[PDB]
Amino acid sequence: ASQVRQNYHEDCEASINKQINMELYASYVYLSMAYYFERDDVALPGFAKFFKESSDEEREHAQTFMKYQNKRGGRIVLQQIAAPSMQEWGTGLEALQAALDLEKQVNQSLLELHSTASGNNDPHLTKLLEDEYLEEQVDSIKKIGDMITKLKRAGPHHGLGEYMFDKELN
Amino acid sequence: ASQVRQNYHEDCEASINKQINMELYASYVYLSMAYYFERDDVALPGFAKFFKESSDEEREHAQTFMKYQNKRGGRIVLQQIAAPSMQEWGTGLEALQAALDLEKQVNQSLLELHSTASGNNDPHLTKLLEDEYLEEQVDSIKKIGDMITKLKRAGPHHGLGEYMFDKELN
Amino acid sequence: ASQVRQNYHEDCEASINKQINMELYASYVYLSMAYYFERDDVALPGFAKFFKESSDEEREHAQTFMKYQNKRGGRIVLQQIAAPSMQEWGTGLEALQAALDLEKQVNQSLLELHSTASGNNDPHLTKLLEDEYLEEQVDSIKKIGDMITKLKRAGPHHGLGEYMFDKELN
Amino acid sequence: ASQVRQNYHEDCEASINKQINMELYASYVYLSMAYYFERDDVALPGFAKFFKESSDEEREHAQTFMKYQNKRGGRIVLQQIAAPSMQEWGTGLEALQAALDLEKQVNQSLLELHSTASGNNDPHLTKLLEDEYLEEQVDSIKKIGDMITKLKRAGPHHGLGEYMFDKELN
Numbered sequence: 001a002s003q004v005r006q007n008y009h010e011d012c013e014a015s016i017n018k019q020i021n022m023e024l025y026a027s028y029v030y031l032s033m034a035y036y037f038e039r040d041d042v043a044l045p046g047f048a049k050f051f052k053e054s055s056d057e058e059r060e061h062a063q064t065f066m067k068y069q070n071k072r073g074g075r076i077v078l079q080q081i082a083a084p085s086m087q088e089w090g091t092g093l094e095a096l097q098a099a100l101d102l103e104k105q106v107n108q109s110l111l112e113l114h115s116t117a118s119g120n121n122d123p124h125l126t127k128l129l130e131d132e133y134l135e136e137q138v139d140s141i142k143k144i145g146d147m148i149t150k151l152k153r154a155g156p157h158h159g160l161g162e163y164m165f166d167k168e169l170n
Numbered sequence: 171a172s173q174v175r176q177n178y179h180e181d182c183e184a185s186i187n188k189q190i191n192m193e194l195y196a197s198y199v200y201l202s203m204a205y206y207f208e209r210d211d212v213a214l215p216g217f218a219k220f221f222k223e224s225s226d227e228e229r230e231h232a233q234t235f236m237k238y239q240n241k242r243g244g245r246i247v248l249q250q251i252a253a254p255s256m257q258e259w260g261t262g263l264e265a266l267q268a269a270l271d272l273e274k275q276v277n278q279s280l281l282e283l284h285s286t287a288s289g290n291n292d293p294h295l296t297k298l299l300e301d302e303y304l305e306e307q308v309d310s311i312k313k314i315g316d317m318i319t320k321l322k323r324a325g326p327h328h329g330l331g332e333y334m335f336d337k338e339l340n
Numbered sequence: 341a342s343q344v345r346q347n348y349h350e351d352c353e354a355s356i357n358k359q360i361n362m363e364l365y366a367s368y369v370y371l372s373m374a375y376y377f378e379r380d381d382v383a384l385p386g387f388a389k390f391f392k393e394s395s396d397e398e399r400e401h402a403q404t405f406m407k408y409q410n411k412r413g414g415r416i417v418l419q420q421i422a423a424p425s426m427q428e429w430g431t432g433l434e435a436l437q438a439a440l441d442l443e444k445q446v447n448q449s450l451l452e453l454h455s456t457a458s459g460n461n462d463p464h465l466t467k468l469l470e471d472e473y474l475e476e477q478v479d480s481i482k483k484i485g486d487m488i489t490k491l492k493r494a495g496p497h498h499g500l501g502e503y504m505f506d507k508e509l510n
Numbered sequence: 511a512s513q514v515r516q517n518y519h520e521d522c523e524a525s526i527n528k529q530i531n532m533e534l535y536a537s538y539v540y541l542s543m544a545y546y547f548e549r550d551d552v553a554l555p556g557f558a559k560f561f562k563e564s565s566d567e568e569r570e571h572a573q574t575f576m577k578y579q580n581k582r583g584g585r586i587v588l589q590q591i592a593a594p595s596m597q598e599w600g601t602g603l604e605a606l607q608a609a610l611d612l613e614k615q616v617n618q619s620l621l622e623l624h625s626t627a628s629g630n631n632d633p634h635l636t637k638l639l640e641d642e643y644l645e646e647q648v649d650s651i652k653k654i655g656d657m658i659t660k661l662k663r664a665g666p667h668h669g670l671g672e673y674m675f676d677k678e679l680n
């Protein structure tokens with residue numbers, strides 16, 4: 001085994017590899033949304049910028065797990081990254097609602113990761129998940145929830161409301 | 171009695187203690203409104219900021235009466251602060267209308283304080299009430315009145331008008 | 341339920357609402373002490389400044405729980421804030437000893453909050469309590485303990501010792 | 511009569527002339543105290559500085575009434591300034607207690623001036639007394655009261671307490 005490995009269970013190492021793929025996939029989904037909103041027949045530059053940032057952050061999130069894997073002495077195994085579930089995302093509200101549910105799906109995965117780490121008495125992994133992932137995930141879900149509510153107030157259907165709300169995201 | 175006390179009637183000292191509690195209560199009401207508007211299903215950041223500032227100011231107003239009480243040689247007596255009348259405040263217009271009526275209720279109390287001070291020939295207390303409270307109260311009522319009118323013009327019902335008007339408060 | 345709510349148990353949401361009230365109450369107690377020490381017949385400006393800062397911090401502590409409640413999708417319920425247990429606090433030592441016991445009462449409540457969060461497998465809430473409350477609480481108790489010891493050394497009874505020790509707090 | 515005089519009653523003009531003399535007298539008393547505390551066998555430089563400032567302020571207070579007299583069209587009449595009641599003032603506490611009672615004697619005179627102005631429907635004179643005299647007088651009495659309390663705590667009798675308290679006034 002690795003000269004550095006200590007108190008690092010095989011199940012946590014495997015779950016990290018799965019979470020790496022999930023972060024890469026979320027990054028890919030947000031990249032799809034980002035350039036969907038730059039289409040000449042969608043033209044929502046604020047939504048495009050918002051999802052491009054989210055795509056970059058999820059790719060950073062995946063790399064933090066990869067660095068973590070190496071730091072604990074595990075071995076990174078990369079799988080294929082699935083095509084995004086959709087290729088057209090509808091209106092801003094429908095993309096936000098899809099993002100909201102993706103984020104809660106990732107949050108579920110992270111809490112199950114924490115349960116695995118807690119069950120194998122790995123306080124270093126539980127600290128990583130609390131400090132770097134579960135905190136950011138709850139804030140993202142709250143931010144998206146706020147945005148959904150604001151967009152519903154401004155007018156969620158392809159109209160002046162969506163046009164004005166898009167400026168708030170720029 | 172206090173070595174500093176002079177021309178300070180027991181009725182004014184008692185009315186100040188009542189006004190302290192009323193200011194603390196108004197502060198609590200505005201704190202309730204402030205974090206009501208930060209709910210993921212309300213998401214009016216401008217209203218939230220407006221009421222958070224008002225909550226801070228009313229707590230400052232209470233402390234100015236407490237300093238005043240001590241300066242005149244009276245004794246501060248603190249009572250319980252009642253729960254806010256409501257826990258959900260509806261739309262922006264309904265919160266502003268509730269704030270407008272709270273502010274005029276506080277103004278009434280202050281004018282009655284002035285009548286007590288004037289009836290006991292306390293020009294120092296009448297000067298405090300005119301310079302530090304009655305001036306600020308009239309300006310607050312005018313500001314809130316302006317806002318109510320502006321929000322009714324922009325569209326008071328959970329729509330684009332309320333969304334845009336909220337940006338003016340940010 | 342809230343679009344953002346996830347892994348947030350009803351018992352934690354209710355305990356947070358109770359802790360909000362306790363923080364508001366501690367803030368009120370420290371406000372009472374603060375302006376007690378600005379009385380013309382007490383005149384301990386250092387103690388007054390120390391308790392005024394503590395009052396501000398406890399009000400900030402309550403707002404962090406309110407933001408937290410909203411972030412997790414719970415609903416803030418505000419109750420009345422009880423009058424402070426006393427209206428006169430004696431000497432500096434007696435106020436510090438009262439503060440010490442209030443702080444350990446709040447610490448007990450927070451550790452029980454952590455037990456509730458830990459029993460419902462809420463690592464996000466346990467992280468909040470460890471990072472933002474239990475750390476600050478232990479440091480506050482140590483600081484107050486140091487001060488009590490220093491004041492007993494300098495001379496705790498209404499004398500030169502209390503007068504000099506008060507300058508250290510300014 | 512004066513080309514500028516308007517709504518200025520003879521009783522207010524006469525009472526202002528009396529208050530001018532009282533301010534000049536208080537200034538003289540504080541000058542006596544100031545150089546009493548610079549005696550080689552008293553040597554309280556902090557008390558000396560405190561009373562020298564108070565002497566300067568009371569002389570400024572007298573000149574503000576003189577400017578006021580001229581502004582309203584009255585005529586300044588200056589009387590003799592009595593010798594200070596004492597020539598030796600004892601300890602710091604005894605000088606502060608004498609100052610406290612002089613300040614409340616001046617405050618009484620000012621409130622009676624306000625009653626004269628209010629009885630003759632002179633809102634300009636009542637504004638002067640509230641804004642420039644009654645406000646400063648209450649703050650001075652509170653400050654002196656605080657100092658008396660602090661000096662009694664530190665030790666009012668010719669000892670280390672008075673020596674240390676004197677440094678706070680420097």
Ligand SMILES: [Fe+3]
Nearest residue numbers: 023058061106
């Ligand atoms: Fe992520």
Ligand SMILES: [Fe+3]
Nearest residue numbers: 193228231276
């Ligand atoms: Fe107010």
Ligand SMILES: [Fe+3]
Nearest residue numbers: 363398401446
């Ligand atoms: Fe706290």
Ligand SMILES: [Fe+3]
Nearest residue numbers: 533568571616
């Ligand atoms: Fe004066």
Ligand code: NI
Nearest residue numbers: 091156157158
């Ligand atoms: Ni639609």
Ligand code: NI
Nearest residue numbers: 261326327328
């Ligand atoms: Ni409506």
Ligand code: NI
Nearest residue numbers: 431496497498
């Ligand atoms: Ni004692």
Ligand code: NI
Nearest residue numbers: 601666667668
């Ligand atoms: Ni003596």
